């Protein structure tokens, strides 16, 4: 019971159904094997993968990461390969600094293509705030906020 | 006290937003109660 | 709406015990390799396979009803024996 609860609660984005059963390996003995059967969330038809956006990432490796993530049969495809695709792309940006460049959403899904969309943000507004704290015997600091520094 | 903790556990199983955000297009998360019957008479759809 | 009648029918294009299994369904067929992708003429409008699981919990309800019934009669000293014999007769 607790194995089923822990496995169902740990990977709820990918599996969400585990059934566990036991069966005796031999008569006149209490030894028995236990089997775990998972039915993952499936997605009913994905043939191709496309990556859109991403004007900073060159075409030399988008091709190889689209080639790596391919399944074999088109008809019953698990959700988690979706989570594999962005796990490439995010990592690439996280290897190059860039903490605001991420895979936003997938917009294909009706013509059989899984199409990731990459969002790349840019700086718009720079603002400065002037604060000072106050010395008391309290553990929490209160502040005096100014629009302009002295 | 045990009842209040069980209500928090029930919220985590039933209204989990990481599953709610992807329910149009990636998953199927619908609000139902417990399953009451396994078999119904065939003309039940006439109530709709 | 005119309500529908639940009468078994006879005849058909098949002998009884069979259905029409070469009937055409508007639903696409995907090849294993896609390259230079364009689009699909017939789309897959409902893409997720929805298998949210609910169990039938009749035995748990019966145990809870048994506890309530022998708590109403002010005899919870009988609880372990009665619940144990009900669980034995489940087997």
Instruction: Judge whether B25 is closer than 8 Å to chain C, CB to CB.
Output: yes
Interatomic CA distance for residues A31 and A25, integer angstroms: 6
Residue A34, strand partner residues: A22
Instruction: Judge whether B38 is closer than 8 Å to chain C, CB to CB.
Output: yes
> Which chains pack against B, by 3+ Cβ pairs within 8 A?
A, C
Q: Where are the alpha helices (DSSP H) in chain B?
A: 2-14, 17-20
Q: Which residues of B touch C55 (CB under 8 A)?
A: 35
Decide if A44 and C30 are in contact by the 8 Å CB cutoff.
no
Residue A17, strand partner residues: none
Nearest chain B CA: its distance from A108 CA (Å)? 10
Decide if C52 and B34 are in contact by the 8 Å CB cutoff.
no
CA angle A46, A52, A56 (to 5 degrees): 140
Q: Which residues of B touch A106 (CB under 8 A)?
A: 25
Q: Which residues of A touch B25 (CB under 8 A)?
A: 106, 109
Are C46 and C26 within 8 A, CB to CB? no
* Method of elucidation: cryo-EM
Decide if A72 and C32 are in contact by the 8 Å CB cutoff.
yes
Quickly list DSSP for C33-87. ---S----SS--S--S-------B-HHHHHHHHHHHHHHHTT--TTHHHHHHHHH
Instruction: Judge whether B32 is closer than 8 Å to chain A, CB to CB.
Output: no
Q: Which of C4, C52, C55 lies closest to B29 in CB terms?
A: C52
Please give the distance of CA B35 from its chain centroid, rounded to a whole number.
9
Residue A102, strand partner residues: A119
Pairing of strands A130-133, A143-146: antiparallel
Q: Please state, in angstroms and as integers, the Cα–Cα distance from residue B47 to each residue in B37, B40, B44, C2, following that order.
A: 17, 13, 6, 13
Q: Please state, in angstroms and as integers, the Cα–Cα distance from residue A65 to each residue in A58, A84, A90, B28, B37, following that order.
A: 12, 10, 12, 29, 48
Q: B13: Cβ–Cβ under 8 A, 6 or more apart, which residues?
A: none
Pick the residue from chain A with its C-alpha nearest to B23. Answer: A13
Interatomic CA distance for residues C27 and C19, integer angstroms: 19
Decide if A41 and C48 are in contact by the 8 Å CB cutoff.
yes
Interatomic CA distance for residues A21 and C91, integer angstroms: 17
Q: Which residues of C touch A114 (CB under 8 A)?
A: none
Interatomic CA distance for residues A92 and C1, integer angstroms: 58
Short-list A72, A70, A7, A73, CA closest to A40: A7
Short-list A25, A26, A98, A13, CA closest to A55: A98
Are A85 and A116 within 8 A, CB to CB? yes
10 Å Cβ neighbour count for A28?
A: 5
Decide if B25 and A109 are in contact by the 8 Å CB cutoff.
yes
Instruction: Judge whether A14 is closer than 8 Å to chain C, CB to CB.
Output: no
Instruction: Judge whether A75 is closer than 8 Å to chain C, CB to CB.
Output: yes
Resolution in A: 2.5
């Amino acid at each position: 019971l607790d194995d089923r609860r822990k496995l169902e609660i740990q990977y709820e984005d990918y599996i969400a159904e585990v059934e566990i059963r036991t069966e005796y390996v031999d008569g006149k003995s209490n030894h028995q094997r236990v089997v775990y059967k998972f039915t993952p969330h499936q997605f009913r038809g994905i043939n191709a993968i496309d990556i859109k956006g991403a004007a900073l990432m060159p075409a030399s490796e988008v091709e190889r990461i689209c080639n790596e993530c391919l399944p074999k049969q088109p008809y019953m495809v698990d959700i988690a390969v979706m989570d594999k695709v962005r796990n490439r792309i995010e990592q690439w940006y996280q290897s190059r600094g860039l903490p605001f460049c991420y895979v936003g959403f997938f917009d294909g899904m009706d013509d059989g293509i899984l199409r990731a969309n990459v969002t790349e943000a840019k700086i718009d507004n720079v603002s400065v705030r002037f604060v000072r704290p106050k010395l008391t015997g309290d553990s929490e600091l209160e502040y005096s906020v100014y629009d302009e520094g002295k | 006290n045990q009842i209040k903790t069980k209500k928090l556990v029930a919220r985590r199983i039933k209204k989990r937003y990481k599953l709610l955000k992807q329910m149009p297009n990636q998953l199927m998360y619908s609000p139902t109660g417990p399953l009451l019957t396994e078999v119904l008479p065939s003309h039940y759809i006439s109530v709709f | 709406k005119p309500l529908q009648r639940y009468i078994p029918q006879n005849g058909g294009f098949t002998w009884p015990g069979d259905y029409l299994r070469l009937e055409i369904v508007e639903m696409p067929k995907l090849k294993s390799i896609n390259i230079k992708k364009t689009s699909l003429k017939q789309k897959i409008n409902v893409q997720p396979v929805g298998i949210m699981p609910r169990k039938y919990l009749i035995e748990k309800h019966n145990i809870k009803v048994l506890k309530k019934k022998l708590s109403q009669a002010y005899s919870t000293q009988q609880l372990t024996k009665v619940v144990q014999e009900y669980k034995n007769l489940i087997q």
